[PDB]
């Protein structure tokens, strides 16, 4: 057996914002109960896309943590780079605590590499009061009706959509992906087609909005995005469900009591489905000496539903129902928004991510930015994604048909 005290490290990229139950306060509850398995949790200091790059460096140097947050979209990539540890025999014991979909997303070739933590269905946030002032009395359900409403809003200096060039690889991929995968293994080779009917419909929607100067073009993570919420100009947008508390904080309180969550309309060729934008597992890394206890702790951590919800997560756990915090329902006009998140999750399309998708997302963002001043077309996001996807697979030494 192990010695009396096993020490585990967990690196995460949860927000830990004001109002949230901090990861360290969650882990402190574990540590008090379990002197036998002590956990040191740290938040990655850096932007999200740099985390798996640090993990790569640290695995090689022998400085890696036992446990690390790894997006579902990132897992095939870090697996292919040899950064993970097969923990199938441990995952199997905790399987029943988690939804089957998310659980399948910690697997590669029927081997499990950690446990699922949250999901990222796309939804629509809007200020119902401001919609009413503009005469928009229903969420438009077709792209054409939405675009018409958006032009009405824009003429009034309001915007019912944002175009987020720094999120094209996550949000726009998810919107296009709602109606069909881009990546499939066909035996000895990958087959790539990022130019699906969904990609085309998604491009057309944003193109018409941008041409009409009827969507904001501020990068999501820039202060200019927050300012557009605070100043009342951005009154509607697609958002990943985990954005809720982030968006609330970014608003400064503007529109509190008037915001609502709706399912995505049929704006993206999505035909009643939504798609994933982020969502993460926590994986056990290659040279962790204590995979059993890492997974023991992880199962506990990933089933602390209310605490995870406080971080904005839509938990993968099925051990208890997630409930909308009182502060959130108050901001969102009394709405039980978690119910909308659950509906969205249940209507979210499956989407395989090729190993190396980080390069695809990088290219998507670069090309997306060209569309903001009309130097590029929105459709080029997807034609470039096609080429970068094929190139990246080949760079990994993988066969492409
Ligand atoms: C899918 C994901 O991990 N989303 C993150 C989100 O990540 C994007 C942002 O960091 C933007 C900032 O510009 O960068 C994007 O990466 C780009 C990068 O900007 C380019 O320079 C480079 O060339 O390409 C990359 C793409 O490879 C990131 O993708 O960041 C937000 C805010 O920090 C995160 O919240 C979000 O992750 C989700 O966080 C939730 C907690 O708030 C949950 O953990 C959820 O599961 C995560 O998916
Ligand atoms: Na073949
Ligand atoms: Na291009
Ligand atoms: Zn114990
Ligand atoms: Zn051990």
């Amino acid at each position: 057996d192990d010695g009396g005290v096993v020490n585990i490290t967990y690196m995460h990229r949860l927000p830990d914002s004001e109002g949230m139950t901090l990861v360290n306060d969650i882990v402190a509850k574990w540590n008090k109960q379990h002197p036998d398995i002590q956990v040191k949790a740290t938040k990655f200091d850096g932007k999200a896309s740099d985390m798996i790059k640090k993990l790569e460096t640290d695995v090689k140097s022998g400085e890696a943590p036992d446990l690390a947050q790894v997006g579902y979209a990132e897992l095939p990539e870090v697996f292919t780079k040899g950064l993970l540890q097969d923990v199938t025999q441990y995952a199997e014991q905790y399987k029943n605590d988690f939804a089957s979909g998310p659980y399948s997303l910690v697997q590669v070739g029927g081997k499990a590499y950690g446990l699922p933590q949250d999901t990222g269905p796309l939804v629509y946030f809007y200020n119902k009061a401001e919609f009413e002032k503009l005469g928009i009395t229903e969420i438009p359900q077709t792209a054409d009706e939405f675009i018409a409403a958006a032009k009405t809003a824009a003429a009034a200096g309001k915007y019912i959509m944002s175009y987020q060039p720094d999120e094209a690889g996550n949000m726009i991929s998810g919107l296009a992906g709602a109606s069909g995968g881009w990546y499939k293994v066909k035996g000895d080779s990958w087959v790539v087609n990022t130019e699906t009917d969904g990609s085309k419909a998604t491009a057309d929607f944003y193109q018409q909005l941008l041409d009409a100067k009827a969507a904001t073009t501020n990068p999501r993570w820039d202060p200019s995005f927050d300012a557009s919420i605070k100043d009342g100009s951005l009154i509607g947008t697609v958002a990943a469900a985990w954005e809720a508390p982030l968006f609330m904080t970014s608003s400064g309180g503007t529109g509190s009591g008037e915001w609502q969550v709706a399912q995505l309309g049929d704006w993206f060729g999505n035909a009643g489905k939504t798609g994933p934008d982020g969502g993460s597992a926590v994986a056990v890394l290659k040279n962790s000496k204590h995979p059993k206890e890492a997974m023991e702790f992880l199962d506990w951590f990933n089933t602390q539903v209310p605490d995870l919800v406080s971080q904005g997560l839509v938990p993968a756990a099925t051990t208890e129902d997630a409930e909308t915090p009182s502060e959130w329902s108050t901001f969102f006009g009394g709405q039980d928004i978690m119910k909308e998140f659950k509906t969205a999750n249940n209507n979210m399309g499956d989407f395989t991510y090729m190993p190396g998708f980080s390069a695809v997302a990088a290219k998507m963002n670069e090309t997306a930015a060209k569309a903001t001043d009309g130097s590029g077309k929105v459709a080029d996001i997807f034609s470039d994604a096609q080429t970068t996807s094929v190139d990246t697979l080949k760079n990994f030494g993988l066969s492409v048909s």
Side-chain angles (χ1 to χ4, degrees):
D1 266 355
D2 289 340
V5 180
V6 157
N7 288 283
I8 298 305
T9 45
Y10 169 30
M11 186 185 25
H12 67 84
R13 49 179 176 91
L14 300 179
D16 272 346
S17 299
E18 292 175 353
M20 299 189 166
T21 302
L22 299 168
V23 174
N24 290 139
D25 289 320
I26 304 165
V27 176
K29 295 181 65 182
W30 172 271
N31 284 344
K32 188 165 174 72
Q33 286 323 294
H34 297 287
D36 59 300
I37 303 158
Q38 289 289 286
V39 181
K40 183 164 60 177
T42 55
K43 176 173 168 63
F44 176 64
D45 188 12
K47 70 178 116 86
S49 66
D50 280 336
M51 182 160 169
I52 61 162
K53 299 177 166 72
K54 182 183 167 46
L55 292 182
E56 186 169 351
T57 298
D58 291 353
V59 168
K60 190 43 156 269
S61 78
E63 227 190 357
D66 299 280
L67 289 168
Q69 180 174 342
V70 172
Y72 303 128
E74 293 179 321
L75 196 141
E77 186 163 335
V78 296
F79 164 85
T80 305
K81 292 188 159 189
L83 309 178
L84 309 185
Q85 187 173 154
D86 175 353
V87 287
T88 303
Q89 66 160 325
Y90 310 115
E92 284 174 338
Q93 297 313 309
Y94 309 110
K95 184 177 191 155
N96 288 167
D97 283 351
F98 297 102
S100 61
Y103 185 81
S104 75
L105 306 181
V106 308
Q107 293 178 293
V108 178
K111 291 170 174 175
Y113 294 93
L115 296 172
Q117 184 173 82
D118 66 310
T119 65
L122 294 154
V123 298
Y124 186 64
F125 293 175
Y126 70 104
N127 185 317
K128 180 155 188 156
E130 299 285 359
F131 269 50
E132 297 286 334
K133 288 170 182 168
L134 290 162
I136 309 163
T137 60
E138 99 194 287
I139 298 306
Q141 290 301 107
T142 62
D144 285 349
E145 177 129 316
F146 189 96
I147 291 164
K151 286 164 182 176
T152 298
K158 295 294 200 201
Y159 306 96
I160 65 168
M161 190 49 64
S162 74
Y163 177 77
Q164 297 175 18
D166 57 342
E167 284 291 336
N170 311 312
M171 173 177 289
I172 283 171
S173 65
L175 295 172
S179 52
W182 290 354
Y183 306 115
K184 42 150 182 177
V185 171
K186 280 220 43 166
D188 60 345
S189 295
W190 286 90
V191 179
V192 177
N193 176 19
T194 65
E195 291 177 281
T196 59
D197 298 351
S199 296
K200 295 179 191 278
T202 296
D204 186 46
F205 179 73
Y206 285 104
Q207 190 67 67
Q208 292 194 226
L209 293 171
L210 291 173
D211 286 349
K213 275 66 209 166
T216 68
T217 57
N218 306 121
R220 175 61 180 83
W221 306 107
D222 279 0
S224 59
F225 189 93
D226 295 7
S228 72
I229 311 163
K230 293 183 206 295
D231 70 25
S233 59
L234 183 64
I235 55 166
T237 184
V238 172
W242 45 258
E243 293 186 52
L246 309 182
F247 194 91
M248 280 169 53
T249 297
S250 286
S251 77
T254 296
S256 175
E258 308 171 329
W259 290 93
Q260 295 286 94
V261 175
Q263 300 304 307
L264 290 184
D266 189 19
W267 312 321
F268 312 102
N270 48 307
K273 298 297 264 195
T274 187
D277 171 351
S280 311
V282 178
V284 181
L285 298 192
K286 184 191 161 69
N287 302 123
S288 175
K289 307 298 261 155
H290 296 285
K292 186 170 184 174
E293 298 82 40
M295 292 282 281
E296 171 72 350
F297 157 79
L298 186 53
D299 170 77
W300 178 87
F301 186 90
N302 283 5
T303 57
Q304 302 312 295
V305 168
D307 296 340
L308 298 170
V309 167
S310 85
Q311 292 278 339
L313 305 187
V314 182
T318 50
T319 48
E320 61 179 279
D321 289 336
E323 303 191 338
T324 304
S326 60
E327 299 82 357
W328 298 15
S329 50
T330 292
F331 187 89
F332 287 90
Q335 194 182 7
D336 184 358
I337 70 177
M338 184 60 69
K339 183 163 156 43
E340 293 293 339
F341 299 163
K342 258 53 176 59
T343 296
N345 181 260
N346 295 168
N347 282 331
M348 176 167 74
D350 291 331
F351 193 91
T352 295
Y353 295 91
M354 46 166 272
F357 185 77
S358 69
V360 186
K363 187 73 197 182
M364 290 179 69
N365 283 12
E366 186 184 84
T367 303
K370 290 6 159 213
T372 69
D373 65 10
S375 78
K377 296 284 192 168
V378 180
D380 299 342
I381 291 167
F382 302 105
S383 59
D384 291 2
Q386 174 72 22
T387 307
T388 300
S389 294
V390 174
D391 293 353
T392 300
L393 285 168
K394 285 174 160 172
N395 288 332
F396 256 137
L398 304 164
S399 168
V400 185
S401 186

